[PDB]
Write a protein that binds this ligand. Structure first.
Ligand SMILES: [Mn+2]
Ligand SMILES: [Mn+2]
Ligand SMILES: [Mn+2]
Ligand SMILES: [Mn+2]
Lengths: 334, 335, 333, 334
């Protein structure tokens, strides 16, 4: 079927002066955290997945107030995930199936994704996403300040190539059973130049030559056991130094670190807060699964509630952000 | 950003012949038979870790073809013709990506040579197998491939499971690099279903594709932190496959983590499989073997017929290993 | 530079159910006139060129009332021509929508499709001249009648194009009056052709067309005017000799009025007289009309042409009443 | 149906150093003629249409010997016409239907046309053709030293735009009834820059901005009456100067100047030969319909015989060229 190329969506929704400026600078600001030049804490926070742009915009307006408030301690960027990797099968996100009913209206979904990202950046909220597909990025990577490569794809050569050509910093998650070396290796690969086949903005396949991405880091997201504590952070930091790549890392409070219990994301954040207080020198960022309303639901019946992984609600979100900001204020004072 | 010819340009210059088309169609059907337990021959995916020299490849194929015919009642021999290689971090990604082996990345030439070699192989009677790594290169030559692999590093990847769901050949999913078998079992489940995703057409344009699912996927045991080739591991995998409601017939890789990356250990693994086939071995439908004209590996392509990637057994050792497997499977089939 | 393909525009501006029905119906009604099943007179009327969407909609709202009023005698369809072909030298609303040498073709094609959809949606069907081989895919779905101009009637590329169009097509005689080239064009366009074209996705392809059975000639003058009974009778003779339809359209403007735009009325009266006497070979007329009569080099006066001079609204009422009255009498025989 | 783009053909049949040099040199030589820097006579000579590459190459090998023999007096370039305009319907040429059987194998036809042109340039014979289609030129214009726009398309805006973007000199024929102003007007238009839609080497439609073609001229090819004589040449020269364009022009010995009778081309050439002897300062070239065997045939039964317009045969061709060379040697001595 008949896919509109990126240029069609770029013509309807060109990046504005403000969005372009916000993306450019947030990427720069994140590079400084990745390389230990600034000691603010990157916070990637928001829904497991976007299934309703309206709830997403409401969420973003609340989050914007806290982004501003804590701007000296925390660098807040919203989770805006449009592509979801499933264990076997299931809804792959808003792009793949925006009407949430098996109609796979991908043109509508890409348009909605771009429109949401443009609106977010226009309001002052930078955005992040996981890059899962090789073709979808040309539709909206210009509006992304930070990207993730998921646990299920960190070891994949086509995803490392993708990352090597992205203009934003990229986090690589450790593997689903806890393997960190694949992520360390991914930084090596993505940091170098690659030649590979991709698709242009006009929608045609082409040979691209990337320059490499100097702003990649790892993300600790648990395995058979959680890997967020000081002992794990120290082990990982030594392995990063050994490989000659940045030893500054991100810690995901959710997924296999909370072991799929949204109420434990706060516990993880408190452990991180104590590391920042005691030392915490290898930590540059945290990831949190958060929505307007806590929990999850199989069907999109309740507004502002996840249909994928369970999230903390808005009030726990305010608490969690206050805790990290206070803890990092103390770290930054040393 | 450089000037890629679309699949239709290569297809025009190198159209599939009646003979190649018959060989592919038959070989896929025969392999399907093995996957679903209808025939008890052993699929043998055998040849170089990587193809870097089409002359040496054609010579290899010539020698192998005699053995394919000789052992045809006990073994279904298909050549490894791997054109895309995953690197640990960085390095030469294969003949397609850089066919002149010097960082000129002449991909139009690479794709052309890959198709030419596959067409020449099928025309001489040797079916071909490859690892599908890239999302766009398959359209250039998948019509000439009888069996496909998704590698250990990409079995968990949703975009690779999608690709597999639209392939017309049977597909083997390798267990993960540390030993995880569940990802490959999950992959069979995923690739067996219909998917909708973005891909590139034969004309070189991006499009929405809707696949029908691939009913002929299976797992490949290739070792992890510890090897997983033995009877206990096979029995344990078979139980997991049945619990997930997918085929309990599997393939065993003698190389990579099952040989502890020591090419001289491939024969020990094959000897263990032979022993399983003689005793029972009902869940084994195939084996994988990294093999070339000359054993070992080299950083540079100085020696003819010697791998520049993973180390391989040599030709003599290939005769030994194939004879061992054909003997042992003859007995399995007899009962 | 970076051309959006037709599918980008078709996505933002899908044809409505109402527009689709109007185009479908009007094409058929026109075909009925081309082949003598109905004796209403097609009238292709409106500006020489469209340079202002706002004025074009205002003109359409006025024309719509007369379209309905005269519907038993006349089939009124608006002229929505975006440009000229030049002898040489403003390059039309598509090729240059900002009227300033910036050639913003993406914007121009978008604006063209937008206007055509709005026109169809209000009940006014639209006609245009197809000048190039690529632009038609962006809006031919909104066109009820197409023209091939005098300067391109003889061209094999344009005959091919016409053979694949889903609307009826009029071929103008040559710039110096040559009628044979238009007669030959109908014959060429009625057949199947294989040739290279561009798809709605923006890619070159081989297309195989089925032929267009609803083509006709248009008399637009030359070395001398060719609107009178004598010239109409000779054309009809030549048409029947070539085995194609002997129903034709008369352009009141261009080389039939020459240097006086007000002569369109005289041509129209001569046509009225033919209709009253007999006039059996006339299926249509073309008229260059706008809100305000005349022309201007620069777009200062609202609703006045910036290409060829046009009769104004009051004279348009006059000319349509005249034609409707005359054709009423022809249909009553 | 499934059209290979130009790049597919360019990859299989890249232009050689030799062909590239011959085309560059020949284009420059022809420009010098159009602008009166040189008084050699351009001679565009060969079949009405190509229906058989084998005969065309045999024809070229004979013509090369004369090309070389007359090089100080004549600039001989072969007619290699692959696209034919029909009065109503009929075979449109080798590209459109190479197997001459209603199969329209256009991929094969383009491949065969490019192959022939490359072979011709490689043997030392430059080539000319009529550019009828908007899309086919990308496949082989790099191998063409001179182009024609036909009588039936000279008045066409799209053909004038096409001409404005070509790298070769272009001749515009007067209209089919004898109108010369359309060709004079065409030179005007094709000398300007244009913006229009075209198709790329990769097979995608795009906006192209051409720089104008400063090497255009008119071709006198007859109308109701012929227009080859001194008086018509003299009339056309005055109008060229009046429009401010080159008053050097080309005369077609065939088509409407021969009343469609192949035995009259020699009479036209003889008239031209007298003008060249008397004065003939405004003539820069001639066009002649020539083949191995004279006349025409309905089916491709006889080898080297036209299936379109009737042509003079090889013997008459030698006579005609000797005549023009002898006459122009004298013009050039003054
Ligand atoms: Mn999640
Ligand atoms: Mn290997
Ligand atoms: Mn006009
Ligand atoms: Mn001819």
């Amino acid at each position: 079927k008949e896919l509109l190329p990126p240029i069609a969506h770029l013509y309807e929704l060109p990046i504005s002066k403000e969005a372009s400026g916000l993306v450019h600078r947030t990427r720069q600001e994140i590079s400084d955290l990745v390389h230990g030049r600034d000691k603010r804490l990157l916070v990637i926070i928001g829904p497991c997945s976007i299934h309703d742009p309206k709830a997403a915009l409401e969420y973003a307006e609340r989050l914007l107030k806290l982004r501003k408030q804590y701007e000296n301690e925390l660098l807040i960027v919203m989770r805006v995930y449009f592509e979801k990797p499933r264990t076997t099968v299931g809804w792959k996100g808003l792009i793949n199936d925006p009407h949430l009913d098996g109609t796979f209206d991908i043109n509508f979904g890409l348009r909605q994704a771009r429109s949401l990202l443009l609106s977010l950046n226009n309001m002052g909220m930078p955005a992040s996403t996981e890059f899962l597909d090789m073709i979808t990025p040309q539709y909206y990577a210009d509006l992304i300040s930070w990207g993730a490569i998921g646990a299920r794809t960190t070891e994949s050569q086509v995803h490392r190539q993708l990352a090597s050509g992205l203009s934003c910093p990229v986090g690589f998650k450790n593997g689903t059973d806890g393997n960190l070396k694949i992520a360390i290796d991914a930084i090596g690969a993505a940091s170098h130049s690659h030649h590979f086949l991709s698709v242009t903005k006009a929608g045609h396949s082409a040979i691209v030559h990337t320059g490499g991405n100097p702003d990649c880091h790892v993300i600790l997201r648990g395995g058979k056991e959680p890997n967020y504590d000081a002992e794990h952070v120290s082990e990982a930091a030594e392995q990063l130094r050994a490989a000659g790549v940045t030893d500054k890392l991100m810690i995901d409070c959710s997924h296999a670190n909370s072991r799929k219990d949204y109420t434990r994301q706060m516990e993880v954040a408190q452990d991180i807060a104590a590391q920042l207080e005691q030392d915490g020198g290898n930590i540059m960022g945290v990831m949190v699964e958060s929505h307007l309303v806590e929990g999850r639901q199989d069907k999109p019946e309740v507004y502002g509630k996840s249909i994928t992984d369970a999230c903390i609600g808005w009030g726990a979100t305010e608490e969690l952000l206050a805790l990290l900001a206070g803890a990092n204020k103390k770290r930054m004072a040393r």
